[PDB]
């Protein structure tokens, strides 16, 4: 929906350039359209947890995943699992076959890229795979905003949160941002006149 | 020995991990500013090893422009330096690795022993405990942060100027003219006035001035 972390889509896909693991598990955030892909030799029960796992790692836990229906997407274990994670479970029979489409794509260009015509020598697999990743999620898909930039939102602040502070008063004061604490008091910088004061630590609230 | 934002400074290691045999070598690269890790399991330590292991942290956190080591001869072939240099990053062999390692090691301790694993974990759930591991660390905030490491390492604070301090010298006395960027428990950042220079010095040596 309108939001990382909201619904993902999972399909399981062969590229037989990544043999003896060909079997690719792919997962793309609907809202961001990051990818994440893992390798396995067969689609079994496990493999599906593990891919899921990973891709949580780097994502962050959504609330719901659509996938197609079974065997191992309908596996006893799978859905024990995604109740234990509490992820809500879509099934059906679309956005992550375009991902497929973008993978193979660029898993072609890359390995012809570094010379291997066929399948790709085993042990360079998961640079390959991880330089796939890379390009897909952080390098421009077209004249209009990367995945990266979607799902994070990247930005670099100059202050913390706004605070109150306490004056000659009494009175608790907004307009304040905190910079750094330090020995019990906070650096704090007015956003209107950008000035800064060392301020004793009890005299600052969050706004 | 430290970035004041992500991206800048990462420090990478190789940890063994028991639990996880036979494939027991787990690559681990902090980013210095953002505390975020990734972790790779590899099977020996190798320069093929290494460079996927770099390419995978690459992939989830962005292309750092440098990486400290140490003396370790798997960052040092040929083949590897080769690799930095083909992407441009910078490599030192000048403990925050070390830290995450600890981190590391006590969460894959806890979730092995959480489902029965007092000894090597099963083969086949190796790979998802080391990812729950992975979330816990980047996704969950560590203690005292009111962000998580990922978020930190996405939407980080820069400092602009930073405010101004006094630092005891060396002789002892608290000097006046400096301002600090970071102020973590264990080391702050701080800039000279007259120069371009940040130094990152104890935290019982930095005090704010007036």
């Not at 898993?107 to 991880?130: C, H, N, W, Y």
């Not at 209009?144 to 930005?155: A, D, L």
Request: net charge positive; aromatic share 8%.
């Amino acid at each position: 929906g309108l939001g990382p972390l909201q619904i993902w889509q999972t399909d399981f896909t062969l590229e037989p350039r990544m043999a003896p693991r060909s079997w690719l598990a792919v997962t793309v955030d609907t809202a961001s359209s990051a990818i994440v892909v893992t390798q396995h030799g067969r689609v079994t029960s496990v493999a599906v947890q593990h891919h899921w796992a990973t891709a949580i790692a780097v994502l962050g836990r959504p609330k719901a995943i659509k996938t197609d229906n079974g065997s191992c997407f309908t596996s006893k274990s799978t859905r024990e699992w995604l109740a234990r994670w509490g992820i809500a479970h879509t099934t059906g029979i679309a956005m992550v076959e375009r991902a497929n489409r973008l993978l193979k794509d660029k898993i072609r260009v890359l390995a012809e890229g570094d010379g291997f015509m066929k399948r790709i020598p085993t042990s360079k697999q998961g640079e390959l795979l991880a330089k796939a990743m890379y390009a897909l999620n952080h390098k421009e898909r077209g004249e209009n905003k990367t995945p990266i930039q979607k799902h994070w939102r990247p930005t670099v602040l100059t202050e913390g949160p706004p605070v109150k502070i306490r004056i000659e008063t009494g009175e608790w004061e907004k307009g304040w941002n905190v910079l750094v604490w330090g020995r019990g008091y906070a650096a704090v910088k007015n956003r209107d006149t950008d000035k800064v004061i060392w301020v004793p630590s009890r005299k600052v609230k969050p706004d």
